Design a protein around this nucleic acid. Structure first.
Lengths: 77, 149
RNA sequence: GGGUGAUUAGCUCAGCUGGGAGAGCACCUCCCUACAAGGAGGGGGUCGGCGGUUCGAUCCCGUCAUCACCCACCA
RNA sequence: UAAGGUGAUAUGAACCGUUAUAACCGGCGAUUUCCGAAUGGGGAAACCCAGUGUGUUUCGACACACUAUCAUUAACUGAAUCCAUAGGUUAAUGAGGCGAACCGGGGGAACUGAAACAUCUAAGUACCCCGAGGAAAAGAAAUCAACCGAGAUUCCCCCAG
RNA sequence: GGGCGUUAAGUUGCAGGGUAUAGACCCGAAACCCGGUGAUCUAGCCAUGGGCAGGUUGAAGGUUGGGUAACACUAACUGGAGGACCGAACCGACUAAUGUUGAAAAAUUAGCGGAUGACUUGUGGCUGGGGGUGAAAGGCCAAUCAAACCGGGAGAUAGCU
RNA sequence: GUUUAUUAAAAACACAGCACUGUGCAAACACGAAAGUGGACGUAUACGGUGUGACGCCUGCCCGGUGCCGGAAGGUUAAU
RNA sequence: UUGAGCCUUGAUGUGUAGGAUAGGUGGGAGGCUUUGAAGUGUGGACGCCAGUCUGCAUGGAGCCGACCUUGAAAUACCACCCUUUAAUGUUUGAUGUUCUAACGUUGACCCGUAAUCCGGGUUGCGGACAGUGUCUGGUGGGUAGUUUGACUGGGGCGGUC
RNA sequence: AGCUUGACUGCGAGCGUGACGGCGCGAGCAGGUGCGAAAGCAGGUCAUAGUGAUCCGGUGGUUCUGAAUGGAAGGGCCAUC
């Protein structure tokens, strides 16, 4: 599934409800674009899977626990 | 977004001055192209308490010539090796560590070009005046081997 | 067998909230020259039959006469 | 713990004991083939075939040992490539497959009811997908409450029809 | 003025009749949705390998003699084209026949149609159930079919036999 | 030549061909939301979709409807 | 270039009649021009032909005013507001143009890798489009869910509720 | 013809009809009045067809309500659409 690695953003519950008033499912997802950036603890530029607003979380939130949680789940960057 | 300028870019500020720019232009050009750096209420030392005091002494108190002015300042012939063909094909002289140099340095290893050619496409032998324009305060020029013999 | 709609100027046809009739093309007379043609002038209505509703009925309603058309419909 | 026993079809045959190896029961371990996670490398269920070492003689070869990948971390090495990164070679720890329930999250109907149907009903119910622990999950108020007060959460009964 | 009210006692346990909801009365549709099986049948594609006794037309192509401006012509020599002639295998399934709790869950007989071809076919692989595959018939898919088979929702629901 | 295997072998189906049309190659397009793969590793004398069906001689009328292509101003008209 | 928006600072502001270019709306004597006043008319731009000007020749704070005279209104020196103008800072649309730096490569070649997929690099070219998403208008029996009555000496046709 | 607009407001001994929904009729009391000399009649027309529920919604009125306290949105009531 397409998920954001820094925020943990997942698929959502949601319906059509317009034309008709129906509870019909449509499958709702975060739109991925990625970001290629620097963290100073890795001796390299890093490309990480991010979606809308996820790059603006990296801008001003501390991520070293998530960089460790990805590794605690074995996920690659 | 607060940034410090490291190159001649934009009309606002100058080299070593802190300026405010849109986060968009600070994301696609200025930071990834190395032309500027963030300030973060912390990085405001990056030039003024790190780069600006040796600037007044290096070649006028501690020594008499700057780090490449002790190597070249007049018109020099290129010293990096060259070899051309019978149809005048130059077979190089334009790649990051094979392009024209006149100072014959040793023990050092380079990854990007610093010079401006008179034409950004060069395949054949001839006369070429090559310029060193990496910083607007500085100018040096060299001439290539016209036969690459 | 059953059904749709019409009937008014020679022919095509208008005119339904229910208010005593009108056009086109012919035609008739005349002009031009002899007819085709061109032009000018002019015309008259059983506005289906008999009943009913109405002040008033071709006009709304019934029913007969007529025409053209539709149709004779499951096993 | 005992003077009698050595599984069943099951006879048949032969022995083992009285006191420590008769028989056997409890605990904690040792040993633990091939296939199966199944994993040195391969396979169409028990078959096929290597790598790296150690040891030794008469050295046309045995005996014994170690070895999936992935992840975390370190070491050693190391492409384009300078610093570096992958890739390369190891080590330490960890998942992986399984009986049962309880149980956490995900994907999620149709039947049926509206005495036809379309929001609604039915129903987060079944079936499915992943998965943990002695329980899972709950949790220490930007919370209720109505000016009086209570002071994390769970379970049982009310609150409620 | 009018209407409704100010004297009938309910409540709790058992015994019973009814009602609602429970499988709600017993057996019982077609059908729907979900989770699977089957492509050794049969269809089609992919790859790799088979089958076609024998007889016919002797053409086409090849080449040289005469010869023309130039061939087509004229005269010999040579030679093996077919969704061609006919006919077993084999395949087809047009007509006749036997069979119908069959020898056969359409098979067996004879005539007939094809018979190097758009022919016929062995082994594997690929495609599947609201899904496949079709020189098409909404034909066929392991004896079952305009939704096969198996397991669940589910003792579904049925003003009905 | 094909077909309702098992009541229809046909006039239906198929076909060189004929017509109408899509497609500039990361083609059009398919199944999958994608991952890929096929078309095709072909390139408008190639490939896709559809109809029509040897050949000969010929082939009138219609843009009201339904779909397409172009014209591009304007109208009805969304989020904003 | 043109819409929606701003007020920041220098300039701009006159028919008639008149000394005479009084913007509007209010103050009132000593205050000021610095990218400004002259020379002032040769050439050019305007004009009510009265006057106004960039530039160039040319210069740097003078000088001017109330009484008076014209005139709704007054003539130093001036706050604020408007019109005409220009530039500066500056939020946000419409349309077209440029660049390179997001994005792209099913462009070249380089390496892991004597790999077809991949990743990153070197280097070009496309280029803020295309792409990807959210909202939104159309188009969509290609596919899908669902409805379309009862009466009748039997239906239809007719007539009926 | 003259005036009048009762094409009434709050009610009601109650009553005929029908399984019910529903329809149809009304003695008689009072409010505010009209015709008339007055009684009396007028509760629309001589009697019988011209339209039927529940729901959301339109309009104006409303200390009946309104959600911790005070408004207001919302609810009801009255009148009509």
């Amino acid at each position: 599934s397409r998920v954001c690695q820094v925020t943990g953003k997942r698929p959502v519950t949601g319906n059509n409800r317009s034309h008709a008033l129906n509870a019909t499912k449509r499958r709702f997802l975060p739109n991925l674009h990625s970001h290629r950036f620097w963290v100073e603890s890795e001796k390299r530029f890093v490309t990480l899977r991010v979606s809308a607003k996820g790059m603006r979380v990296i801008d001003k939130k501390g991520i070293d626990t998530v960089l460790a949680e990805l590794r605690a789940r074995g996920e690659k960057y | 977004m607060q940034v410090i300028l490291l190159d001649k870019v934009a009309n606002l500020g100058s080299l070593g001055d802190q300026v405010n720019v849109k986060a968009g232009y600070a994301r696609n050009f200025l930071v990834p192209q190395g032309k500027a750096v963030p300030a973060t209420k912390k990085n405001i030392e990056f030039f003024e308490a790190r780069r600006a005091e040796l600037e007044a002494k290096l070649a006028e108190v501690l020594a008499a010539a700057n780090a490449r002015a002790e190597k070249i300042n007049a018109l020099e012939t290129v010293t990096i090796a060259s070899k051309a063909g019978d149809e005048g094909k130059l077979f190089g002289s334009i790649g990051t560590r094979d392009i024209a140099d006149a100072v014959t340095a040793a023990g050092v290893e380079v990854a990007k070009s610093e010079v401006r050619l008179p034409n950004g496409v060069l395949r054949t032998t001839g006369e070429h005046e090559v310029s060193f324009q990496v910083h607007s305060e500085v100018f040096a020029k060299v001439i290539v081997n016209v036969v690459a013999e």
